[PDB]
Assembly symmetry: C3
Homo-oligomer: 215 residues x 3
């Protein structure tokens, strides 16, 4: 069940989080796509493939469908429409695998309601702050992205799926990590991505209900 | 005129605000619905009936249409579509009664534009912060709900009706009540609901222009 | 290229910014519209005509189409639909002139996605904070308008055009001007309007890239 997860940790395919995400995309160079790919083909496991509109992502999907083996969660970058998810859904249906979409673009953000409602196999949406800000021409800070975040959480809640917050960049700014994570929880995010295991415990704790609440 | 009104005070049907709202809903227990109903049936007056999608609300509406007597304002909880308001409007076509809708759900919020335009009898919308927060999975604090609030004020303003802010929970935090009320006024709320008479003078004062402003 | 511009200065027809806007509208009295009109008919130049839904604006357009001469930028107030811009576009297809729409109303804001996509001739959108706040019944301050600004910037970014921030009212509050300009920049605005030449250097400087960026 996707709602229980609190921490999603990105580690590149080349080489305690609640979910590990094997990454084929932005951490992986263009030259490394085939090597990271087949490595990955070899506790719930996620795989972020390259975008459907990339040759890398077509290759990734082809390899997945051939060598048989699939993660519990397929993470699709630059999810921009419900058709993005429905294509994956139909593709994965031949050969129990659930989808996670990333909302990292304006186009994606404008269609977020229909994206969140696209298919039962969708298990959550990740906010992509850095690309969202870059697409808009904004700073990565909270305030310019606050609209986007609130709109994302609402679409998730409307469809009974968790909103997963963007990763926090500064591994060294534990204060900043604590503040942003708390802000996301108050907004209604159920989880937050991460790019370093040092962030995990902070993230786990803050997205964990209190004994008072559990009662 | 609804725009002049500043304070809306909820008092349960069982038993100086500009409008009093006799409540059949959340303050009244389920066992108490019949008592409160007929007692309520017994300066402008509002009645909040139970939701249209509840057996309680059907009975309330049945009793209203039967025993003849109607308030100046009919307050509908959990307004989620234009049809909600139009059904009441047609039901009220036999037997001068105006409607107030409550936006307390994501579904309501997403349809807020069409709701604000639903019928001429609609005289205003109340924000239901606590249920909205719960529906989203967010905290009741200002920030997670600012989008929801801004979207509500805008749809109201477009249809020439006042936006009425949620009641403030903490009766003891007068500071918090002043701050939120001022925030709501700045946003374009023209009025605010209340759950205790101690809040009334504060709400009235803060929504009353100053001699400085009038000059 | 509109993206290069940082400062847009409104000056009434009656009487170093990157673009000067000769203004026929709110700075010009109604008695002065004919007067102001014909002077203007006699470094890139912008012209804000009166609204299409005003007798003044029809006359302004008539005068423009007759005496042959057109500004580099035609600035249209109260842009409320895609048709607003398309009408102007077709009117000036005979006699290189690009359009700038002003989003200053709730109706304009709700249609901002379709306005920003209306025609290739559209080169940017200006936020009209003072009319937007008044239309909503809100204060002119940042917070009540933050949702509106984020929605405007998003629509611009999606269509490959710059968002231009509203002018800051207080000429004497240089601190407020600096703060608003930075917030706008962070939000993803590429430029900001001005209503007095004293504001120009501040706006220019703050929208000028640092050596770190340039590298």
């Amino acid at each position: 069940d996707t709602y229980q997860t609190r921490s999603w940790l990105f580690t590149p395919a080349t080489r305690g989080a609640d979910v590990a995400i094997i990454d084929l995309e932005d951490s992986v160079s263009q030259a490394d796509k085939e090597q990271a790919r087949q490595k990955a083909i070899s506790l719930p496991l996620a795989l972020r493939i390259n975008g459907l509109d990339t040759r890398a992502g077509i290759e990734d999907i082809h390899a997945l469908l051939e060598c048989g083996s699939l993660p519990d969660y397929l993470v699709l970058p630059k999810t921009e429409s419900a058709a993005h998810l429905q294509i994956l859904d139909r593709l994965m249906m031949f050969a129990d695998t659930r989808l996670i979409g990333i909302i990292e673009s304006v186009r994606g953000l404008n269609a977020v309601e229909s994206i969140a409602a696209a298919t039962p196999k969708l298990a959550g949406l990740i906010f992509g702050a850095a690309d969202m800000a870059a697409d808009i021409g904004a700073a990565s800070t909270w305030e310019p992205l606050a609209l986007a975040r609130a709109r994302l959480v609402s679409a998730c809640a409307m469809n009974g799926i968790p909103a997963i917050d963007a990763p926090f960049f500064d591994v060294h700014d534990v204060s900043g990590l604590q503040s942003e994570t708390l802000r996301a929880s108050d907004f209604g995010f159920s989880a937050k991505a991460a790019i370093h295991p040092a962030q995990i415990s902070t993230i786990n704790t803050l997205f964990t209900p209190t004994a008072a609440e559990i009662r």
